[PDB]
Amino acid sequence: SPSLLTVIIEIAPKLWTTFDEEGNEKGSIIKVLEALIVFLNAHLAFNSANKVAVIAAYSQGIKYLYPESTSALXXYRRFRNVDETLVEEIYKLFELEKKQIEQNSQRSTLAGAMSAGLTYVNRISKESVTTSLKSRLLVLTCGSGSSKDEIFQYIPIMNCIFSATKMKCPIDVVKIGGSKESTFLQQTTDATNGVYLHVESTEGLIQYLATAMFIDPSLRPIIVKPNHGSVDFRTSCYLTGRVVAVGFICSVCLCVLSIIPPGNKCPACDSQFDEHVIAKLKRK
Amino acid sequence: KHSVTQYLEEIPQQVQNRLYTSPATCLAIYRILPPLAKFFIMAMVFNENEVPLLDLDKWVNSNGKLQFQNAIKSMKSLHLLIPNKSSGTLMINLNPTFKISLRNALTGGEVQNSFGVVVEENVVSLDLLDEYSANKWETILHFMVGTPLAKIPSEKVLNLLKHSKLMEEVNSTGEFKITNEGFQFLLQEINSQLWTLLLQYLKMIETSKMDLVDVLHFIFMLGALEVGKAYKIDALSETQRIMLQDMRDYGLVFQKHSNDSIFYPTKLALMLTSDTKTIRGLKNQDIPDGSLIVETNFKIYSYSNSPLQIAVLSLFVHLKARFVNMVLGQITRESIRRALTNGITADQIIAYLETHAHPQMRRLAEEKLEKKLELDPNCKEPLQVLPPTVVDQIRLWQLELDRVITYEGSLYSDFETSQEYNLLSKYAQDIGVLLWKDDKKKKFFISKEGNSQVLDFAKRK
Amino acid sequence: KKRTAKKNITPYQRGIIRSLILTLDCSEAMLEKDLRPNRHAMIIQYAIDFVHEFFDQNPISQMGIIIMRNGLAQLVSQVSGNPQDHIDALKSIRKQEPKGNPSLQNALEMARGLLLPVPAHCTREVLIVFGSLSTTDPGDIHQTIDSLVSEKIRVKVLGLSAQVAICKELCKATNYGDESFYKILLDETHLKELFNEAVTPLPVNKINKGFTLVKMGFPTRIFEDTPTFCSCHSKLVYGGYFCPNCHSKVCSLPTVCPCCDLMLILSTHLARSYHHLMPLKTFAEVPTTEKFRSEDCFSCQSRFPXXXXXXXXXXXXXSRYRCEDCKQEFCVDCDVFIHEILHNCPGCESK
Amino acid sequence: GIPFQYTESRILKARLEFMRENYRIRENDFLSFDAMRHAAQCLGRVLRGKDDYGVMVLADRRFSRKRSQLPKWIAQGLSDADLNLSTDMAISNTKQFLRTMAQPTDPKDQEGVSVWSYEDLIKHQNSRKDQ
């Protein structure tokens, strides 16, 4: 009853550098990947050699990592490649950076990265003609500042979940960084039926990994190990930035508001509001 | 399924601990375990502090938590772990030898054995030996099955078969034909064929040079990968060499000639723990390799074929007229008597035939099935899924041919009252002798030789 | 080698909050054997899938059922929000068999009252699966059709293997003249997506009222499974949500507030739409020679997209349906899939 | 059936006398055509605009001999295989044709030839039809 793991890993050099600033500069993500590096090997050793895949989201964009994109054309010799082969690309990609890259931080390629895996999952899944492979992906992030929360990625991420459900592929996320729990993600894992652990940075979390992230693939008879409640009072009033529970969704615009609206022209859709109806809101 | 695990656990810990040195085995056996085991093993794999028990039970929620037992039984059954009921709890940890035997392997330890494969100039071709053993690996089936080609010439191999005695044929005349084991020999092709045999090596493996790790390691080292050289030159104990000689003799090993080299890793070793794609002069393509026709017209319907599996399939049906890619052979009420002439029910036949030869019967599984899966409650009268019509007739003929049971020995007769029966015959049904337990019979039955607990207690009543 | 819905042009407006009443002919006409048990069974069969399929893309839209037998309009399932209730109501009927003629006139009017209670924003909308070749109308129709328009009731029918003017008129009139809604199937497979296309909202070139703010709130889960109770089913619900305002429990749902009467969804329901809101321009096939991009899929990772010069195979199809706005390539199935399941253009996502 | 009038009297025949004795016409000449002269006379009403369509059946054995007297566009619209149809073979074609025609069969591109892109293709094609 094999499966497939598809790690998704960001590399935010700012955050990765900020990772040195975060806590101590006592060993950056270089620690992390190391911890990850072996973690796969278990997953390989785990099932009847069920395959894996890694995709990374660098600054200017993203890149598959393990599946060895068309390039030419010890450790049980099957492990030994997988990592040290991938490691090349992580280094080869690690070569890819400079301030011109460092200038266009206008977004985080995280969200698009997630998508690609799903595609990739489907790519395998749709070709998975024989002995269909249940599968799950996994995320990690050096959650740091310079964007307390990007908001554009809201939508596309959520489109992932709907797909994930339909693809029946759970996700899992392991955020390490500032004490800022990405509801977005936390919602995602919950909806995707995964786990989440905003643990600190220092530890070599292999201890976490095996425990907290070996569970789903096919097993899933078993208690999740998530954190406390995942309050789903979703995105703040876009007009304000005030997280909403007594919402105000406009209309065909679908924007989310508070009692703020200017009475006209939804502040995402140029739609003057029904003034009589707008007044009817004042009925209290 | 003999569940080699079962053979594995038979031994006591010191031997188990003996073996856990060879890391790959630890990994190999890791694959064997049920997933929970695999799971919790990791949970303990990287925390060097023995751990309580309920916690683990507190890992699992409801239904499925029985597997916990099925898990914990297993690991305890082979005692990989070491319990510690010091503080009333169960402080648990793996056999650390084994645990480190894994960890070292898991993160590039000092595993010279599991990493014994010293790669070299790869002189291996895909078709190169692709049947080079497969011939010997196939011919042995025929030689075992009994055919034109002496594919079963291995004196040791034959002596193995004779020692293994799993085949029902006249060893006095030399035959070791399809017994139930022979029928089973027909049954478990790859996983069955390999493992079902492999123990025979151990079965014969009792006299000299125990060296089980040097034995077992020679297996899973083979089970590791096609490292070719670097071991067959030196990196193998003499027990390995004999095993190497045996492995090539068993065919299961891709050792070339010249008796001085590291043998290639024949595909068999992959197949040994594959449970995956298994198929593989120059014409070697499947699935149609096994080609035949299944239907309720009681005949051979063969365009494609496995030029031995045919005669194997013949083992329940008379060959009448061989042709190039077809043969006239009527598999009928008459033909089935042969599988019963050997004796084995062709019940294994059913799914196997419902599984095999469908390559030539792919339009069949739709001329017959129509995917009659969801229309099940819409029609009171399904259609031939899976085709039972002959199978019913088979099942009919099954009893109809068999239709008897015979016993022999003495006969205990006309007992006294309901203890020797409901004290020591449900107890004979509790010490395993009886060849009949008819309560009111007052008479009971065994096989003559089998009394060591049968003329013993009824006397006491 | 292409059949493309060229431009995704609402371009800015589509009808999200919907109120669809599905109506099915249940007549001996439905008992003819063009379809295997009958049309009727495949109908109810194909109806079933629809419901989720509907509620999937529309977790914010009420819906109810009507059958048409014996020249009678016969509601089967009160318009509501749960799929399952609706869903089960079918199977019940699915075993039962139709009797007597279809009375279209009865159908709409029962709907016309039925669709009255819904708010103004909710798209007051009906869908018909006609099976017969004529009707049996107890009263007028041409007058009746107009009444619908007065109520701004869009309609749409799934004609059987024929065309009937009155409904052909009905759709045309009710969709402010501009007609496409009289689809009649020619093949059963068509019927499959015929339902599926009905799933999405449906403006084309609209008239614009005052589309107002929609008040609503959001509940929150609970913990104590033991403390079970309810306030919408009055059962002992192990523990669920609570009104942000009424602050009362409720059986898990996107339901309305059974205590202070407001709509309570999470948000994902909103998110479930937006791909309906701004869909994507199709990924375009590539030239048979000019592509020269990586020999590996971008979205997926498939080495091919061509054939590396294979006479009448490589020049046969530039298997490189690729995106414009991001101008990055994409696999074959990927574009098939990224346009299908999750929309979220990866290449256009990451730049 | 195929319409006829010799249910009535020499009125035609006596008229036929002059008609036949002067003009090289036989009653049949008059007969076979004039029934058709009335037969299709019904059918022309069936279509009003090229939007419209319909099914036009003929119910008499003798129509088979009568394929060669139709108005040209009719007979052009008449295919061969439709000869001497029985009901069973007939009902299928309509069954499809109805179903098919009911589709919004709107190519909206080949109509240039048949609906003559306005002020342009009549300019175009008749400039090409200048000969």
Ligand SMILES: [Zn+2]
């Ligand atoms: Zn309730």
Ligand SMILES: [Zn+2]
């Ligand atoms: Zn409330």
Ligand SMILES: [Zn+2]
């Ligand atoms: Zn794009």
